[PDB]
Amino acid sequence: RKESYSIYVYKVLKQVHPDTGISSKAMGIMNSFVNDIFERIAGEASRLAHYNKRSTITSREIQTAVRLLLPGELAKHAVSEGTKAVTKYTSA
Amino acid sequence: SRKESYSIYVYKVLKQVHPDTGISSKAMGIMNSFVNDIFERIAGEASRLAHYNKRSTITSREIQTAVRLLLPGELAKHAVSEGTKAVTKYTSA
Amino acid sequence: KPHRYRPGTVALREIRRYQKSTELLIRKLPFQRLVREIAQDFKTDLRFQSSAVMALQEACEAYLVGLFEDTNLCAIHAKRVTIMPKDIQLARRIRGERA
Amino acid sequence: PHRYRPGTVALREIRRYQKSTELLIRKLPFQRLVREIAQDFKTDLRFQSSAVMALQEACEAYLVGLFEDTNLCAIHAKRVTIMPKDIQLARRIRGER
Amino acid sequence: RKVLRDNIQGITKPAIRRLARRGGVKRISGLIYEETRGVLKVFLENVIRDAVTYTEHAKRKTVTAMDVVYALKRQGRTLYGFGG
Amino acid sequence: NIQGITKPAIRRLARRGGVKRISGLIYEETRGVLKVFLENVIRDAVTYTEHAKRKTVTAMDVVYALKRQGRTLYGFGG
Amino acid sequence: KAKTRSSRAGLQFPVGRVHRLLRKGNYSERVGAGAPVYLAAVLEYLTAEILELAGNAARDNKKTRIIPRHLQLAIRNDEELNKLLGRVTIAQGGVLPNIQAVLLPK
Amino acid sequence: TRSSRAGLQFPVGRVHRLLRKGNYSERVGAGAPVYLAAVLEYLTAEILELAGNAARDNKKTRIIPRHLQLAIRNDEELNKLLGRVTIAQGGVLPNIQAVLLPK
DNA sequence: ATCAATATCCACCTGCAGATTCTACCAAAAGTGTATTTGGAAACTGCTCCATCAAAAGGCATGTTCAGCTGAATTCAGCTGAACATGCCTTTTGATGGAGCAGTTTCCAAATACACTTTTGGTAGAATCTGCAGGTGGATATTGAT
DNA sequence: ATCAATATCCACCTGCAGATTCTACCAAAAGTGTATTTGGAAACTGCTCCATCAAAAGGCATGTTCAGCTGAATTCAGCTGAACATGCCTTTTGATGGAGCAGTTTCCAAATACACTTTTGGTAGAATCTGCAGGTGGATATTGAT
Ligand SMILES: [Mn+2]
């Protein structure tokens, strides 16, 4: 038991840089990263919920939130890959 | 369109420490905002310990340890006081 | 004479003064205007709650006054007695608003 | 004999530790310190060898950062030597004391 | 109505001065005024932006006080006295 | 005990920090802020260990109050 | 008859409004029983703490109606409260009358 | 696999479970778990491509902590997002005040 | 050491806009009688975690010296604070018109609950492997002297 | 700016052990199939709350002199804190072990969640009140000129 994001960061590492691998301690830093960002977005996403007497966290609440949480073009490109993934999952 | 507030409640607590004193509307305002803030800081902090401790329920215990963390100095000493007391009274009868 | 107060004497008198009161120093109409302008250039055709604007103003009037102290405490740190951009910029860096 | 001018080492020391990434404080006195403090909070405590790296990693980062901010103050007063003075200004600004 | 333009120059110099006295400053450098404006502008932008984002997410066209309050909270400028 | 954090060690921490010269007093004052730091972090951490009904201080315990304190740490739990 | 829970604890604040805002708050899946009380309590207490300190401010200033300022004064003068509401700002509050000694005459 | 329907590397399900089990809201939409997973991905992706470059710049082929910290505090944005995060074993970027330098 | 010249104080005043009371409806506590779970309370492994024990090896503490950095005292070019006067524009009060919150209603399109059914993701060996880590040999960066 | 003589980085090369990465497999989820509840979207539509104008007035913002005295450039020197080569002891570290103790389970008694039904306590008007904002003036300092 005691699960981690490990595999996933490693897969994505092997795409941007097939020739490169990562250290253990660094793998760890990365884990903490994902966790944190998650928490920040799910949080700001929850507020948007309660805030709007709404009772369900749509993807519209994830996005909009990410606009407030993520700065500059780091944000736009972020929203994109999101709209992307969602556009694809839905059709088929 | 009826929306709530702690208004009555602060006011009750005002004639209690200063019988012959009164509070302005704007102040009552600054008051509701305070209470709500704290109310969020604590339940929100205790919300964390629960997850942290793989516990499904926020007891009056978490609240406390949440108060410890959130309040500073005697304010928290004297704080936990009025509470443990209030809860010891409640349960009893 | 004509009766003139030496320099700085009135400045101190102003500090004591505005520190005893609590009225928003920026004149209201211009602040408002400025608010709509900035917000204009973000989302076209918005409406503003009378209270919304005051809120903004209350918050700003605030920030700046506080940024002004830190600034001041910085001017002192360099033997000076005149706040400057130099002083303001440090304060915001330590503050991290732009380190 | 050949002696190195003043502070020339300081610059050569600075580039070094900045090019490196190893906690500087000595591992044992720290952990020693840790337990002492923590002992005034609760008795007969035990730590994770890791929790101690956590308590050293953390501390050191603050200290390095607090210093950067202390420099920018000392420089700001036309000086070039961080004094207890420089250290408070930077702290009262951040909002610690 | 009429076009809004160069209004940041509406935050008069006398006013900035006053605001600085409540801060404690006794002697104000020349350049200060413009600097302040810049910094004030950057403030408002960040806050207004966020707020409006809360108006745009609630699908409303009017910016409410909460909208403002809610945002000032994100920037940790937690404000009291405008909507609980 | 705090005196364990030696003067030279401090100079190194200072060095990385971008400091070229250093008053003689710093050292005492540096140790000061250092204590206060560890003091606030550890205590908030203990409370966690304690509330947890446990008797040993885990990595998290640190990490957690490390967050409550604004100073957020990566690479030690998550 | 009927005992308002707030009465069992002998508090002034609504223990039941506190239970309710807690459950539907999502802070947790299930809410304890004395949790709503204990909290209404801390809240009552803290509420009467900044109250009194401000009333006096009204008294110091020869007024019988507590207004923002007084509250601000009350907060920024008690080391502890000043602390708890560090990153909080009171609309109309003003600032503590404080001049940097170096700037004063001589 | 739900995650494949979106062509993402990060696990969509894990996230959907992490949301319903987070006390975030009473009920979670389907778009959310995915959108987020992608957003989570994209960002770790961003951090790596930029650390890779780091490692390659050192002559190493293995990403250590310092390789991350360099990529982070050198990208204006990433520095903003993680402004209040500290990396263990990262150090600082080599910067010395011009006024301290000789001449 | 005196005196005007002003600005700060402080108590008395008095109508009125901002509380303080006075009063009805009704959403939300409270009271009950079930239908779950939750979280300890004994019982017990395997960790990790103290602690003892035992040698070198840096790494720290000293005590010498003095280069050059921080402070104190002058000086003055001139920047910024204090007045004054000119007249522009922010207030203050009131009125309309209606854009657009909000409160209902109504209900699909979407999310939730079990009972199973499939694979994946985390472990603990098993098979590589990149640097740590030394060790010279070659400019580099410094520092003192013509 | 060069000349030389220390001391320094710094590439170049290079070998194996602590790690990294790769395997080989088990429960724990993640994913389906069906069958339920619902949130909150769409279409009115009542109606505050917000946008705009007017008008007259006086409250400031501007802009211009003038010069007091603040910031800044110098100069000087006592002495503090960097560089060092010395001498010595406290961190390093390497296991080794016994055991304090995080953690697992397995029941279950106590404490929650539920689903309705009365029964208040709170919220949103009007009816009455009354601190205290804005003026008015003498009394006191508090300044700045002689
Ligand atoms: Mn515009």
mmCIF file of N, CA and C in Angstrom, chain A residues 7-92:
data_model
loop_
_atom_site.group_PDB
_atom_site.id
_atom_site.type_symbol
_atom_site.label_atom_id
_atom_site.label_comp_id
_atom_site.label_asym_id
_atom_site.label_seq_id
_atom_site.Cartn_x
_atom_site.Cartn_y
_atom_site.Cartn_z
ATOM 1 N N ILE A 7 5.159 6.501 -11.112
ATOM 2 C CA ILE A 7 5.100 6.012 -12.495
ATOM 3 C C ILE A 7 4.846 7.128 -13.517
ATOM 4 N N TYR A 8 3.788 7.888 -13.262
ATOM 5 C CA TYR A 8 3.339 8.985 -14.106
ATOM 6 C C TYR A 8 4.327 10.073 -14.430
ATOM 7 N N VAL A 9 5.106 10.490 -13.443
ATOM 8 C CA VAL A 9 6.095 11.522 -13.700
ATOM 9 C C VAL A 9 7.178 10.900 -14.555
ATOM 10 N N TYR A 10 7.482 9.637 -14.274
ATOM 11 C CA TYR A 10 8.505 8.921 -15.014
ATOM 12 C C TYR A 10 8.104 8.723 -16.488
ATOM 13 N N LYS A 11 6.834 8.408 -16.751
ATOM 14 C CA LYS A 11 6.407 8.208 -18.136
ATOM 15 C C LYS A 11 6.576 9.488 -18.912
ATOM 16 N N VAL A 12 6.086 10.570 -18.328
ATOM 17 C CA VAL A 12 6.179 11.860 -18.969
ATOM 18 C C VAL A 12 7.619 12.307 -19.093
ATOM 19 N N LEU A 13 8.496 11.762 -18.257
ATOM 20 C CA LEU A 13 9.902 12.123 -18.340
ATOM 21 C C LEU A 13 10.506 11.476 -19.570
ATOM 22 N N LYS A 14 10.076 10.246 -19.842
ATOM 23 C CA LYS A 14 10.580 9.486 -20.981
ATOM 24 C C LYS A 14 10.085 9.909 -22.356
ATOM 25 N N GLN A 15 9.246 10.937 -22.394
ATOM 26 C CA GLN A 15 8.741 11.443 -23.657
ATOM 27 C C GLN A 15 9.518 12.698 -24.028
ATOM 28 N N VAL A 16 9.642 13.610 -23.072
ATOM 29 C CA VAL A 16 10.355 14.860 -23.294
ATOM 30 C C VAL A 16 11.856 14.591 -23.421
ATOM 31 N N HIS A 17 12.318 13.542 -22.752
ATOM 32 C CA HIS A 17 13.724 13.175 -22.776
ATOM 33 C C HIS A 17 13.897 11.679 -22.597
ATOM 34 N N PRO A 18 13.862 10.923 -23.700
ATOM 35 C CA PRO A 18 14.014 9.467 -23.649
ATOM 36 C C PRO A 18 15.341 9.045 -23.018
ATOM 37 N N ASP A 19 16.395 9.773 -23.368
ATOM 38 C CA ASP A 19 17.759 9.530 -22.894
ATOM 39 C C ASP A 19 17.987 9.850 -21.416
ATOM 40 N N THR A 20 17.083 10.615 -20.821
ATOM 41 C CA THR A 20 17.251 11.006 -19.434
ATOM 42 C C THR A 20 16.365 10.263 -18.434
ATOM 43 N N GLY A 21 16.872 10.156 -17.206
ATOM 44 C CA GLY A 21 16.169 9.498 -16.117
ATOM 45 C C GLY A 21 16.277 10.428 -14.927
ATOM 46 N N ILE A 22 15.715 10.061 -13.786
ATOM 47 C CA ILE A 22 15.763 10.954 -12.638
ATOM 48 C C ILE A 22 16.280 10.309 -11.362
ATOM 49 N N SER A 23 16.762 11.119 -10.422
ATOM 50 C CA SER A 23 17.255 10.593 -9.151
ATOM 51 C C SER A 23 16.060 10.249 -8.255
ATOM 52 N N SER A 24 16.333 9.639 -7.107
ATOM 53 C CA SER A 24 15.278 9.265 -6.166
ATOM 54 C C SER A 24 14.716 10.505 -5.469
ATOM 55 N N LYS A 25 15.599 11.182 -4.741
ATOM 56 C CA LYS A 25 15.263 12.399 -4.019
ATOM 57 C C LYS A 25 14.527 13.398 -4.940
ATOM 58 N N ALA A 26 14.951 13.484 -6.202
ATOM 59 C CA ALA A 26 14.326 14.388 -7.165
ATOM 60 C C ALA A 26 12.954 13.860 -7.535
ATOM 61 N N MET A 27 12.844 12.545 -7.648
ATOM 62 C CA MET A 27 11.565 11.944 -7.960
ATOM 63 C C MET A 27 10.626 12.435 -6.872
ATOM 64 N N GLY A 28 11.139 12.425 -5.643
ATOM 65 C CA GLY A 28 10.374 12.861 -4.489
ATOM 66 C C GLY A 28 9.936 14.308 -4.573
ATOM 67 N N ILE A 29 10.860 15.207 -4.905
ATOM 68 C CA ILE A 29 10.512 16.621 -5.028
ATOM 69 C C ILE A 29 9.298 16.689 -5.947
ATOM 70 N N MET A 30 9.430 16.093 -7.124
ATOM 71 C CA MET A 30 8.349 16.079 -8.093
ATOM 72 C C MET A 30 7.029 15.571 -7.524
ATOM 73 N N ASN A 31 7.084 14.531 -6.701
ATOM 74 C CA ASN A 31 5.860 14.004 -6.110
ATOM 75 C C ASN A 31 5.159 15.115 -5.342
ATOM 76 N N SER A 32 5.897 15.716 -4.402
ATOM 77 C CA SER A 32 5.385 16.806 -3.579
ATOM 78 C C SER A 32 4.735 17.867 -4.459
ATOM 79 N N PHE A 33 5.403 18.213 -5.554
ATOM 80 C CA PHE A 33 4.883 19.205 -6.501
ATOM 81 C C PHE A 33 3.458 18.875 -6.948
ATOM 82 N N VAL A 34 3.309 17.756 -7.641
ATOM 83 C CA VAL A 34 1.996 17.356 -8.093
ATOM 84 C C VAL A 34 1.012 17.482 -6.940
ATOM 85 N N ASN A 35 1.275 16.795 -5.842
ATOM 86 C CA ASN A 35 0.377 16.878 -4.705
ATOM 87 C C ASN A 35 -0.062 18.317 -4.430
ATOM 88 N N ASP A 36 0.888 19.195 -4.114
ATOM 89 C CA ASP A 36 0.588 20.608 -3.819
ATOM 90 C C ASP A 36 -0.387 21.235 -4.834
ATOM 91 N N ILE A 37 0.028 21.327 -6.105
ATOM 92 C CA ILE A 37 -0.785 21.912 -7.178
ATOM 93 C C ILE A 37 -2.185 21.353 -7.205
ATOM 94 N N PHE A 38 -2.289 20.051 -6.987
ATOM 95 C CA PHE A 38 -3.582 19.402 -6.954
ATOM 96 C C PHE A 38 -4.360 20.156 -5.885
ATOM 97 N N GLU A 39 -3.942 19.962 -4.644
ATOM 98 C CA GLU A 39 -4.569 20.595 -3.495
ATOM 99 C C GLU A 39 -4.995 22.065 -3.705
ATOM 100 N N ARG A 40 -4.144 22.865 -4.339
ATOM 101 C CA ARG A 40 -4.460 24.275 -4.558
ATOM 102 C C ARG A 40 -5.637 24.486 -5.503
ATOM 103 N N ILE A 41 -5.694 23.657 -6.540
ATOM 104 C CA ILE A 41 -6.747 23.770 -7.533
ATOM 105 C C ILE A 41 -8.064 23.173 -7.052
ATOM 106 N N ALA A 42 -7.982 22.050 -6.356
ATOM 107 C CA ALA A 42 -9.186 21.417 -5.853
ATOM 108 C C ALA A 42 -9.782 22.333 -4.788
ATOM 109 N N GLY A 43 -8.904 23.021 -4.062
ATOM 110 C CA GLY A 43 -9.355 23.927 -3.025
ATOM 111 C C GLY A 43 -10.109 25.077 -3.658
ATOM 112 N N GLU A 44 -9.385 25.891 -4.429
ATOM 113 C CA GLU A 44 -10.002 27.033 -5.083
ATOM 114 C C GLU A 44 -11.210 26.569 -5.893
ATOM 115 N N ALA A 45 -11.236 25.300 -6.256
ATOM 116 C CA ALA A 45 -12.355 24.802 -7.011
ATOM 117 C C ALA A 45 -13.524 24.545 -6.079
ATOM 118 N N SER A 46 -13.230 24.215 -4.838
ATOM 119 C CA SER A 46 -14.310 23.951 -3.911
ATOM 120 C C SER A 46 -14.990 25.231 -3.509
ATOM 121 N N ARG A 47 -14.186 26.275 -3.312
ATOM 122 C CA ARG A 47 -14.723 27.570 -2.925
ATOM 123 C C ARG A 47 -15.683 28.047 -3.982
ATOM 124 N N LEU A 48 -15.261 27.975 -5.236
ATOM 125 C CA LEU A 48 -16.119 28.395 -6.324
ATOM 126 C C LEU A 48 -17.452 27.690 -6.179
ATOM 127 N N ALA A 49 -17.422 26.441 -5.733
ATOM 128 C CA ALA A 49 -18.651 25.689 -5.514
ATOM 129 C C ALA A 49 -19.514 26.420 -4.475
ATOM 130 N N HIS A 50 -19.216 26.179 -3.191
ATOM 131 C CA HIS A 50 -19.906 26.795 -2.041
ATOM 132 C C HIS A 50 -20.279 28.250 -2.407
ATOM 133 N N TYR A 51 -19.275 29.027 -2.802
ATOM 134 C CA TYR A 51 -19.467 30.422 -3.196
ATOM 135 C C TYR A 51 -20.737 30.645 -3.995
ATOM 136 N N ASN A 52 -20.951 29.783 -4.984
ATOM 137 C CA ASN A 52 -22.098 29.871 -5.885
ATOM 138 C C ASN A 52 -23.312 29.005 -5.525
ATOM 139 N N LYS A 53 -23.545 28.809 -4.230
ATOM 140 C CA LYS A 53 -24.678 28.014 -3.762
ATOM 141 C C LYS A 53 -24.811 26.750 -4.591
ATOM 142 N N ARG A 54 -23.812 26.470 -5.422
ATOM 143 C CA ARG A 54 -23.824 25.281 -6.262
ATOM 144 C C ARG A 54 -23.421 24.135 -5.362
ATOM 145 N N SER A 55 -23.692 22.906 -5.787
ATOM 146 C CA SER A 55 -23.342 21.753 -4.969
ATOM 147 C C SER A 55 -22.528 20.712 -5.702
ATOM 148 N N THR A 56 -22.129 21.030 -6.929
ATOM 149 C CA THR A 56 -21.329 20.114 -7.734
ATOM 150 C C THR A 56 -20.133 20.762 -8.446
ATOM 151 N N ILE A 57 -18.950 20.163 -8.277
ATOM 152 C CA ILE A 57 -17.721 20.661 -8.904
ATOM 153 C C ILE A 57 -17.532 20.162 -10.344
ATOM 154 N N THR A 58 -18.028 20.953 -11.293
ATOM 155 C CA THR A 58 -17.938 20.638 -12.718
ATOM 156 C C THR A 58 -16.494 20.809 -13.170
ATOM 157 N N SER A 59 -16.251 20.740 -14.477
ATOM 158 C CA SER A 59 -14.894 20.937 -14.986
ATOM 159 C C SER A 59 -14.744 22.448 -15.176
ATOM 160 N N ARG A 60 -15.885 23.119 -15.223
ATOM 161 C CA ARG A 60 -15.951 24.565 -15.376
ATOM 162 C C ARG A 60 -15.396 25.218 -14.111
ATOM 163 N N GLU A 61 -15.489 24.489 -13.004
ATOM 164 C CA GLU A 61 -14.990 24.978 -11.733
ATOM 165 C C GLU A 61 -13.501 24.683 -11.589
ATOM 166 N N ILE A 62 -12.993 23.723 -12.355
ATOM 167 C CA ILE A 62 -11.575 23.417 -12.298
ATOM 168 C C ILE A 62 -10.893 24.492 -13.125
ATOM 169 N N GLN A 63 -11.349 24.634 -14.360
ATOM 170 C CA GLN A 63 -10.775 25.601 -15.285
ATOM 171 C C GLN A 63 -10.647 26.998 -14.695
ATOM 172 N N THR A 64 -11.792 27.671 -14.617
ATOM 173 C CA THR A 64 -11.902 29.024 -14.098
ATOM 174 C C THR A 64 -10.968 29.154 -12.909
ATOM 175 N N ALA A 65 -10.998 28.172 -12.023
ATOM 176 C CA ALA A 65 -10.121 28.222 -10.873
ATOM 177 C C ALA A 65 -8.674 28.370 -11.344
ATOM 178 N N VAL A 66 -8.226 27.453 -12.212
ATOM 179 C CA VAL A 66 -6.856 27.454 -12.756
ATOM 180 C C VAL A 66 -6.476 28.798 -13.401
ATOM 181 N N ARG A 67 -7.467 29.623 -13.723
ATOM 182 C CA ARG A 67 -7.171 30.931 -14.291
ATOM 183 C C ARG A 67 -6.700 31.862 -13.176
ATOM 184 N N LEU A 68 -7.239 31.646 -11.984
ATOM 185 C CA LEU A 68 -6.905 32.445 -10.821
ATOM 186 C C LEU A 68 -5.634 31.967 -10.144
ATOM 187 N N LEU A 69 -5.357 30.671 -10.288
ATOM 188 C CA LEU A 69 -4.214 30.012 -9.672
ATOM 189 C C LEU A 69 -2.962 30.023 -10.512
ATOM 190 N N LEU A 70 -3.127 29.904 -11.814
ATOM 191 C CA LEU A 70 -1.965 29.894 -12.674
ATOM 192 C C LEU A 70 -1.755 31.228 -13.362
ATOM 193 N N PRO A 71 -0.522 31.741 -13.313
ATOM 194 C CA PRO A 71 -0.095 33.017 -13.904
ATOM 195 C C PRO A 71 0.228 32.969 -15.396
ATOM 196 N N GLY A 72 0.399 34.151 -15.986
ATOM 197 C CA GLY A 72 0.732 34.306 -17.396
ATOM 198 C C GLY A 72 0.357 33.205 -18.373
ATOM 199 N N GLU A 73 1.209 32.990 -19.378
ATOM 200 C CA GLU A 73 0.973 31.968 -20.405
ATOM 201 C C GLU A 73 1.058 30.546 -19.826
ATOM 202 N N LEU A 74 1.502 30.442 -18.582
ATOM 203 C CA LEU A 74 1.578 29.153 -17.923
ATOM 204 C C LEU A 74 0.137 28.707 -17.755
ATOM 205 N N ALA A 75 -0.745 29.695 -17.598
ATOM 206 C CA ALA A 75 -2.173 29.477 -17.405
ATOM 207 C C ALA A 75 -2.912 29.139 -18.679
ATOM 208 N N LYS A 76 -2.756 29.951 -19.716
ATOM 209 C CA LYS A 76 -3.454 29.665 -20.965
ATOM 210 C C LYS A 76 -3.152 28.254 -21.449
ATOM 211 N N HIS A 77 -1.867 27.963 -21.685
ATOM 212 C CA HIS A 77 -1.439 26.648 -22.166
ATOM 213 C C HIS A 77 -1.965 25.573 -21.218
ATOM 214 N N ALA A 78 -2.106 25.924 -19.944
ATOM 215 C CA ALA A 78 -2.640 24.978 -18.976
ATOM 216 C C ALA A 78 -4.086 24.715 -19.389
ATOM 217 N N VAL A 79 -4.927 25.749 -19.389
ATOM 218 C CA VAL A 79 -6.328 25.596 -19.783
ATOM 219 C C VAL A 79 -6.484 24.789 -21.075
ATOM 220 N N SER A 80 -5.606 25.027 -22.047
ATOM 221 C CA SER A 80 -5.675 24.305 -23.315
ATOM 222 C C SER A 80 -5.638 22.793 -23.110
ATOM 223 N N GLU A 81 -4.481 22.271 -22.707
ATOM 224 C CA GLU A 81 -4.308 20.835 -22.472
ATOM 225 C C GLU A 81 -5.461 20.233 -21.684
ATOM 226 N N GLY A 82 -6.177 21.096 -20.974
ATOM 227 C CA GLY A 82 -7.319 20.667 -20.193
ATOM 228 C C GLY A 82 -8.495 20.546 -21.135
ATOM 229 N N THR A 83 -8.826 21.632 -21.820
ATOM 230 C CA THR A 83 -9.922 21.584 -22.761
ATOM 231 C C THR A 83 -9.648 20.429 -23.708
ATOM 232 N N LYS A 84 -8.386 20.263 -24.106
ATOM 233 C CA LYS A 84 -8.014 19.163 -24.999
ATOM 234 C C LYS A 84 -8.495 17.868 -24.365
ATOM 235 N N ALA A 85 -7.674 17.300 -23.494
ATOM 236 C CA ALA A 85 -8.020 16.060 -22.819
ATOM 237 C C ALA A 85 -9.533 15.826 -22.686
ATOM 238 N N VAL A 86 -10.277 16.854 -22.275
ATOM 239 C CA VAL A 86 -11.721 16.709 -22.121
ATOM 240 C C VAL A 86 -12.446 16.561 -23.450
ATOM 241 N N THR A 87 -12.032 17.312 -24.463
ATOM 242 C CA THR A 87 -12.676 17.200 -25.764
ATOM 243 C C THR A 87 -12.558 15.773 -26.278
ATOM 244 N N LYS A 88 -11.399 15.147 -26.070
ATOM 245 C CA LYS A 88 -11.152 13.780 -26.536
ATOM 246 C C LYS A 88 -11.840 12.653 -25.754
ATOM 247 N N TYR A 89 -11.819 12.747 -24.432
ATOM 248 C CA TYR A 89 -12.438 11.737 -23.578
ATOM 249 C C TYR A 89 -13.920 11.562 -23.861
ATOM 250 N N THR A 90 -14.579 12.675 -24.158
ATOM 251 C CA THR A 90 -16.017 12.719 -24.400
ATOM 252 C C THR A 90 -16.577 12.147 -25.693
ATOM 253 N N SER A 91 -16.028 12.559 -26.823
ATOM 254 C CA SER A 91 -16.525 12.061 -28.090
ATOM 255 C C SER A 91 -16.673 10.540 -28.091
ATOM 256 N N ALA A 92 -15.552 9.827 -28.003
ATOM 257 C CA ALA A 92 -15.581 8.361 -27.986
ATOM 258 C C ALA A 92 -14.819 7.842 -26.772
#
